[PDB]
Amino acid sequence: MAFRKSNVYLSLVNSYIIDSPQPSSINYWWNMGSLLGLCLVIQIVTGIFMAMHYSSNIELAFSSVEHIMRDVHNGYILRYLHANGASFFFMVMFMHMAKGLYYGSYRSPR
Amino acid sequence: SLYKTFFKRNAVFVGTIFAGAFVFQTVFDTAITSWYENHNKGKLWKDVKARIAA
Amino acid sequence: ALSNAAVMDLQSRWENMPSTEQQDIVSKLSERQKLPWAQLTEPEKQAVWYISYGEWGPRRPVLN
Amino acid sequence: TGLHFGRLSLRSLTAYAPNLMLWGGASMLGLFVFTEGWPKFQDTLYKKIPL
Amino acid sequence: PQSFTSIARIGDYILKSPVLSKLCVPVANQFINLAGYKKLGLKFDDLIAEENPIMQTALRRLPEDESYARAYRIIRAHQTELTHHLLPRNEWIKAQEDVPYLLPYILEAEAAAKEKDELDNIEVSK
Amino acid sequence: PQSFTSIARIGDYILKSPVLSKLCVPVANQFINLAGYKKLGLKFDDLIAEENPIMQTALRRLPEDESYARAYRIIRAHQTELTHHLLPRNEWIKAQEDVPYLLPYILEAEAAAKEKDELDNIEVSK
Amino acid sequence: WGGFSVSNPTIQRFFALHYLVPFIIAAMVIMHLMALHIHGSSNPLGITGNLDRIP
Amino acid sequence: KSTYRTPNFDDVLKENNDADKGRSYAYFMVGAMGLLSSAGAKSTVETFISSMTATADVLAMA
Amino acid sequence: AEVTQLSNGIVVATEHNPSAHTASVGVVFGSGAANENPYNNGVSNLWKNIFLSKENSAVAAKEGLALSSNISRDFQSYIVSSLPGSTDKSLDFLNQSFIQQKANLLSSSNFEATKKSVLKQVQDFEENDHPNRVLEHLHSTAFQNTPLSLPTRGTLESLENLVVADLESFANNHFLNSNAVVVGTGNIKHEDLVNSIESKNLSLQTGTKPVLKKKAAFLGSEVRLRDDTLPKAWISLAVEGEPVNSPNYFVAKLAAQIFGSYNAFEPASRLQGIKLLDNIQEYQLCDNFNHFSLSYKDSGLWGFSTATRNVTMIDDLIHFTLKQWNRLTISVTDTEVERAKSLLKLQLGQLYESGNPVNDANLLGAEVLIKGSKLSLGEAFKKIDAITVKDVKAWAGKRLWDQDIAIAGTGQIEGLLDYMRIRSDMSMMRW
Ligand code: HEM
Ligand code: HEM
Ligand SMILES: COc1c(O)c(C)c(C/C=C(\C)CC/C=C(\C)CC/C=C(/C)CC/C=C(\C)CC/C=C(\C)CCC=C(C)C)c(O)c1OC
Ligand SMILES: CCCCCCCCCCCCCCC(=O)OCCCOP(=O)(O)OC[C@@H](O)COP(=O)(O)OCCCOC(C)=O
Ligand SMILES: CCCCCCCCCCCCCCC(=O)O[C@H](COC(=O)CCCCCCCCCCCC)COP(=O)(O)O
Ligand SMILES: CCCCCCCCCCCCCC(=O)O[C@H](COC(=O)CCCCCCCCCCC)COP(=O)(O)O
C-alpha cells in the first residue's frame, strides 16, 4: 500500500486531512473549524515570541508591554496581531457555535 | 513549447517561483516605499531636514 | 413513408450531418410533400419546417 | 549481465542526476528568498547589477 | 426524538376533527412549500435523520425499487445544493408525488420497540 | 542483517580447513554452553529473530510437527524466565538435539531472494 | 543572546523557551507510544512474544 | 435515454482545448499563488526571527 | 509469405498461404460504428446478423461454406470461408445473397426475427459482460459527441427504432465499390481471385460515402456506472493514444507491452518482469489488468483495464499503476525496453501469423483500407528493433506526462476516488 497509509504517523495525517471523506455539499460555514485551527496557532506563536520580553511582576507588567511596543523589532506587530487575533478567535468561534446550533450538529450521534 | 521548459519538470517550476519571488521581494518593497514617501512629500523628516536651511 | 430514426430530432442533428445525407433527406421529404397533407407524421412535419425556415447558414444570427 | 545496486540502481541513479542538480538549484534559489534581509548575507546579495 | 407514533397520534386528531382540519391544514400546506425541500427535488421522508436504530431498521425493510430512487434524490440534492442552485421547475417534487412512503415502515418498527420495552418491565401479579 | 548465506560461506570454510577446525571449533562449543540458551530449553534456531520476510517465509515452510515443538520451547522459555529460574538438568537441550532444523529452510528462501534481485538488475547485452 | 553577552534578553527568553519544550516532549511521547504500539514491546529473550501474552 | 448518450457540457466546455495552452495557464495562476506565498512567508518568518534579535535599548548601550 | 494488391474500381487483396486447408473470401468495408449517427446506431450490427441469419446460412451451408462477420469501429467485414477447391463457389454466394438480391434477407419475417435476436444479445451484453461494457463506456466518454464514441453493438434504445428503410439507407451509403476491399486469405492464389471477379462481374454501387463533419477529438472525462450489487469493480482508464499510420505507432504498442498483462491466479503470470507487480502483490490489489494501445483511423487510446475484488484498496491500485506510467517519462530502464521488444515481436507474431485465415482476412482488409497496403511482418520487426529508450521517453512526455485521462468504471467503485486525485497522479511532483 501507499506510504501515506502504511506509516504510523502519516496515516494520522492521511485519515484526517488527506483522505477524510467529507460530504460534497458543505457550504462555507464549514471552514470556521479550519480557521479556529489557524487562529489558535496565531495566538500560540505570537505568545511565545511575545513572552520572551514580558516580565510578570506587578511593577514590570505594564512597563514591559510598552517595552514590546517600542523597543523590540516588529514588536508592534506581535502585540497587535495577538491582542486583535484573540478578539478574532471569539468571533470565528461564535460563528462556529452558531453553525452547529443552526444546522443541527449538536444532535445524536454527535 | 513553453510547457516543456518551465512547467514540465517540477524542479524548474519551483525554481522560477522562488526566482520570481526573489525579484518580487526587492522590487515591490522599493516600489511601495517610493510611492508612500512620494504621497507624503513635505511631511517626512528629510523634507524638514532640507527646509532647515539657515 | 419515412423512417423514424432519420428525422428524430432534426434540431441538433441538421448541422454536423454529412452533406450527401443532408440533401438526401430533403429529397425524400420533397416526395412526401406531393401528397395530401396531414398524413405526414409529426417528426416528418416539424422537420421540414426546420429545413426551410430554421436557423442554420442563412438566418443565423449576427451574434451567437 | 549484472547492474550495480543496493535497492537503488546505478542505471536508475544516472536518470535522476540531471534532476538532482536542478533540485539543488531550486533550493539555493529558495535559500536566497528567505535569507535576504540578513545583513551578513547581503555581502553577496547586493553584488547583483540591479537591486 | 419525537417518536412518530406520537406525531401521528396528534396528527390524526387534527385531521379527524372537522374544525381543526379546516383551520390548520391550509397553514400546513403553506408551511410545506415555504420550506422548499420540493425545490431541491426531495420528498419529506428523505429528510428524516437516519442515525437512530429505529430509522436504521426501517431503511432495511424498504423495497429495492424505492430504496434506489430514494438513494438518487439524495444525490441530486447534494449536487444541486453544491452548485447553490435549485432544480428546474419541471424537476420539482409535485404535491401528489410527496407521499409518506416510509411512514408505515417506521410505525411498525416503533411499535415493535415499544412492545420490547413494555415487556421488559412487566410485573406479573401473583 | 547478516544473511545466513554469508555465514555459511565463512563457516564452511572454517570447518573444511583442518587447522582452523582444530583451533576455533573448541572455542565455538565453549561459547555455546556459556551462552546458556540450552538451560532454558531452546535450540539455537528458536533465537533467530523472526520479524523479517526472509525468515517469516521459512517459518511457513516448516512442517507441522516441528512447528508445534518450536511453539512449545518458546513458551517453556517464557515461563522459565518469568519465574527467574532455570530448567532442571534433565530438561536441558543436549548437544545432539541442538540441530540446525531451520537452516535449510532459510538458506533456500534466502538464495531465492538473492536471485530475485539478480533479475530485476540484469543488463542484457545486445 | 539577544545582545552582546548573557543578559536580561537571554534569561527572559530562556524561561519562555524552557516553559515550552516540556509540552513538546509531552507531545513527542505520544508520538513515542504510537510507534511502540504497532509492534509491541520486546522481551529479554529476543524471541517472539506473540505466543504467551498477558494483558 | 441510454447511458452512452452523455449530456450537454457545451456551455461549460472550452471551444478549443490545445492541451499545452490550457495547462500553461492553470499552472500560471497556481504558480502566481505560490509566488506571493513565498514573499508572504519570508516576510512572516522574518517578523518572528528578527523579533528575537537585539532590542532597540540594548543596541543603544553598545 | 507475400500480400499483393490491385485495383479495378475495387481493391483486391490476397495473402496467399499454400499450406493451410481453407480459403476465406470476403468483402471488407470502410465504414464501421464510426460512420453512423446516434439515432440509427446498431444498423451496422443489424446488418451482420441478417447476413448470419438462419435462411442465409442454410443456403451457405449446403455448399459447405461457413459465414463470418465482424463489426468494428472503423471497418465492417463479411467473410465466406470454405475449402480450397471452392474459390468461385463462395464468390458466387457473396455476389448472390449479399450484393445482387437484398429482398430475400430483408423480408418482413427475417427482419423481425433478427431485430428480436440482436435486442437479445445487446440486453445480455449490457447486464452480463462487465469487463467489455466498460471499454464501450470508455470510448463513449473519451470521445464524447464525436463519431468515435459510438458503441459497435448499438445502444438498446436506438436498436428498436430501426426499420428496413434504415437498413437499406445504410447499404446505399456505405456498401460501395470505392469503400470495399474484396479480400481473400488462406489457400487461394492471387491470380485465381482476380480472374474470378472478372469472369463474374461483382459490382456493388457507385461511390462517394458520406464524409464526416466532426473529427475524433479526445476529451478527458469520467463516467461511473456504479452498482453495489456486483461482486467486483471493473475500471478502465486511458489517455489519448496514437492513431494508425502514425510514426509513433509501434512506440505506443511497446509502451503498453512494458506493463503487459497480468492474471493473479496463474502461477506463471505472477513471476513476470514488470516492476509494477511488486507493489500489487503484497495485499493483492487486483485480479487482472491488461494494458492496451488501441489505434483507430482518426485517433486512439492508451491505458489499462482492470478488475478487482479488493474494493477498499482501489485507490492504491490506481495510484501504484499511474506512478509506474510516470517511469516511462523519466527513468525507464533499457532492460524494460529490451524485454518489451521481445514480447511485442511475439505479441504481433501470433496475431498476424496464427492459423486462422478468417482472422487474417479481418486484419488484411482493415489495413489496406486505411494504409493502402499491408505492412509486412519482416519489416514491422525492424521498426520495433529500432526503438530506443529515448524514443519511449520522447513519446511518453508528449502523450501521458500530465495529460488528461478518461475513466470508466462499474461494480463497487465507491472506493474509486474522484477525478482530480487521479488526474494529478500523472505527474510525480518530484521530477
Ligand atoms: C487560545 C489562545 C490564546 C488566547 C485567546 C489569548 C488571549 C490573550 C488576550 C486577550 C490577551 C490580552 C491582550 C491585550 O489586551 O493586550 C493576551 C495577552 C498575552 N498573552 Fe495570550 N492568548 C492565547 C495564547 C497565549 C499563549 C500560548 C501565550 C504564551 C506562550 C500567550 C501569552 C500572552 C502574553 C505574554 C500576553 C502579554 C500581554 C500583552 O502583551 O497583550 N497567550 N492573550
Ligand atoms: C520522556 C521520555 C520517555 C518516555 C515517557 C518513554 C516512554 C516509553 C514507554 C512507556 C515505553 C514502554 C515501556 C518499556 O518498553 O520499557 C518505552 C519503550 C521504549 N523506549 Fe522510551 N520513553 C522515553 C524516552 C526514551 C528514550 C530517550 C529512548 C531511546 C533513546 C527510548 C527508547 C525506547 C525503546 C527502544 C523502547 C522499546 C523497548 C522495548 O519495548 O523493548 N525511550 N518508552
Ligand atoms: C476534520 O478535518 C480537519 C482536520 O483533520 C484538521 C487537522 C483540521 C485542522 C485543525 C487543526 C490543525 C487544529 C489543531 C491545532 C493544534 C494541534 C494546535 C497546535 C499548534 C501549535 C503551534 C503547537 C505548538 C508548537 C509550537 C509553538 C512550536 C513552535 C516553536 C516556537 C514558537 C519556538 C521557536 C524558537 C526557536 C529557537 C525557533 C481541520 O481544519 C479539519 O477540517 C478540515
Ligand atoms: C501505567 C500508566 C498509567 C497512567 C495512565 C495515564 C496515561 C493514560 C493513557 C492515555 C492514552 C495514551 C496514548 C495516547 C495515544 O498515543 O493516542 C493518540 C492517538 C493515537 O492513535 P492510534 O491508536 O495510534 O491510532 C488508532 C486509531 O484507531 C485512533 O487514532 P485517532 O484517535 O484518530 O488519533 C488521534 C490523533 C489526532 O491527530 C491529529 C493530527 O488530529
Ligand atoms: C494548521 C492550522 C490550520 C491551518 C489551515 C490551513 C488549511 C489549508 C492548508 C493549505 C495548504 C495548501 C497545500 C496544498 C498543496 O500543497 O497542494 C499541492 C499543490 O498545490 C499547490 O501548488 C498550491 C500552491 C501553494 C499554496 C501555498 C499556501 C500556503 C499558505 C499557508 C496558509 C495556511 C497556513 C498538491 O495539489 P494537487 O494534488 O491538486 O496536485
Ligand atoms: C504564523 C502565523 C502568522 C499568520 C499571520 C496572519 C495575519 C496576517 C498579518 C501578517 C503580519 C506579519 C507579516 C508581515 O508583517 O509582513 C509584512 C508583509 O505582509 C505580508 O507579506 C503578509 C503576507 C502573509 C502571507 C502568509 C503566508 C502563509 C505563511 C505561513 C507561515 C510560514 C511586512 O513585510 P516585510 O517585513 O517588510 O518583508
Contacts of I428 in chain B (CB under 8 A): 10
Q: CA-to-CA distance for I269 and G23, rounded, in angstroms?
A: 54
Q: CA-to-CA distance for I37 and I41, rounded, in angstroms?
A: 6
Q: CA-to-CA distance for A105 and A98, rounded, in angstroms?
A: 10
Q: CA-to-CA distance for G14 and A51, rounded, in angstroms?
A: 10
* Interface residue D34 vs chain H (CB under 8 A): yes
Q: Supply F110's cell numbers.
A: 534466502
H38 lines ligand 6 (CB under 6 A): no
> Which of G3, A54, H20 has the alpha carbon at shortest distance from B5?
H20
Q: SS3 breakdown of chain B: % helix, strand, coil, rounded to 5?
A: 75, 0, 25
| G39 labeled part of a ligand binding site | no
> What are F33-39's contacts with CB under 8 Å, separation 24+?
F37/F93, F38/F92, F38/F93, F38/F94, F38/F98, F39/F86, F39/F87, F39/F92
- Counted domains in chain B: 1
Give the nearest partner residue to G13 out of A8, A9, A52, using CB atoms. A52
Please give the resolution of this entry in Å, rounded to 1 decimal: 3.2
Residue with cell 517610493: B34
DSSP string, A49-103: TTTTS---SSSSSTTTTHHHHHHSTTHHHHHHHHHHHHHHHHHHHHTTTTHHHHT
Contact call for residues I409 and I225 (beta carbons, < 8 A)? yes
CA distances to A95, A98, A107, E44 from A102, rounded to whole Å, are 10, 6, 11, 19
Collect all residues with Cβ–Cβ distance below 8 Å to I141 and sequence separation of at least 6. Answer: H6, I149, I219, I221, I222, I223, I406, I408
Bond into G9 cis (ω within 30): no
Residues 267-306 of I with CB under 8 A from A: 282-283
Residue with cell 494508425: I244
Say if the Cβ atoms of B18 and H38 lie within 8 Å. Answer: yes
Residue with cell 412526401: C32
Residue D35, judged by CB atoms within 10 A of its CB (0-12, 13-18, 19+), counts as middle
Range of the domain at B31: 1-54
Q: Supply D51's cell numbers.
A: 537591486
Give the nearest chain H residue to A52 (CA atoms): H52
Q: How many CB atoms lie within 10 A of CB I283?
A: 12
Say if the Cβ atoms of D15 and I431 lie within 8 Å. Answer: no
Give the CA count within 13 Å in the CB-facing half-sphere of I424: 11
Contact call for residues A11 and A4 (beta carbons, < 8 A)? yes
Q: Domain ranges in chain E?
A: 1-126
Contact call for residues D30 and B14 (beta carbons, < 8 A)? yes
Residues 166-225 of I with CB under 8 A from C: 166, 169, 173, 208, 210-214
Q: Please tell me the distance in Å from I249's CA to the nearest CA on chain C.
A: 29
Give the nearest partner residue to G51 out of F42, F71, F81, using CB atoms. F71
| G32 labeled part of a ligand binding site | yes
Experimental technique used to determine this entry: cryo-EM
Q: Of the ligands numbered here, which is closest to the C-alpha atom of G23?
A: 3
Q: CA-to-CA distance for I80 and I91, rounded, in angstroms?
A: 8
Give the nearest chain F residue to G39 (CA atoms): F51
Q: CA-to-CA distance for C18 and C29, rounded, in angstroms?
A: 17
Give the per-residue SS3 of chain I: CCEEEEECCCEEEEEECCCCCCEEEEEEECCCCCCCCCCCCCHHHHHHHHHCCHHHHHHHHHCCCEEEEEECCCCEEEEEEECCCCCCHHHHHHHHHHHHCCCCCCCHHHHHHHHHHHHHHHHHHHCCCHHHHHHHHHHHHHCCCCHHHCCCCCCHHHHCCCCHHHHHHHHHHHCCCCCEEEEEEECCCHHHHHHHHHCCCCCCCCCCCCCCCCCCCCCCCEEEEECCCCCCEEEEEEEECCCCCCCCHHHHHHHHHHHCEEECCCCCCCCCCCCCHHHHCCCCCCCEEEEEEEECCCCEEEEEEEECCCCCCHHHHHHHHHHHHHHHHHCCCHHHHHHHHHHHHHHCCCCCCCCCHHHHHHHHHHHHCCCCCCCCHHHHCCCCCCCCHHHHHHHHHHHCCCCCCEEEEEECCCCCCCCHHHHCCCCCCCC
Say if the Cβ atoms of I334 and F122 lie within 8 Å. Answer: no
Report the greatest alpha carbon distance in chain E: 67
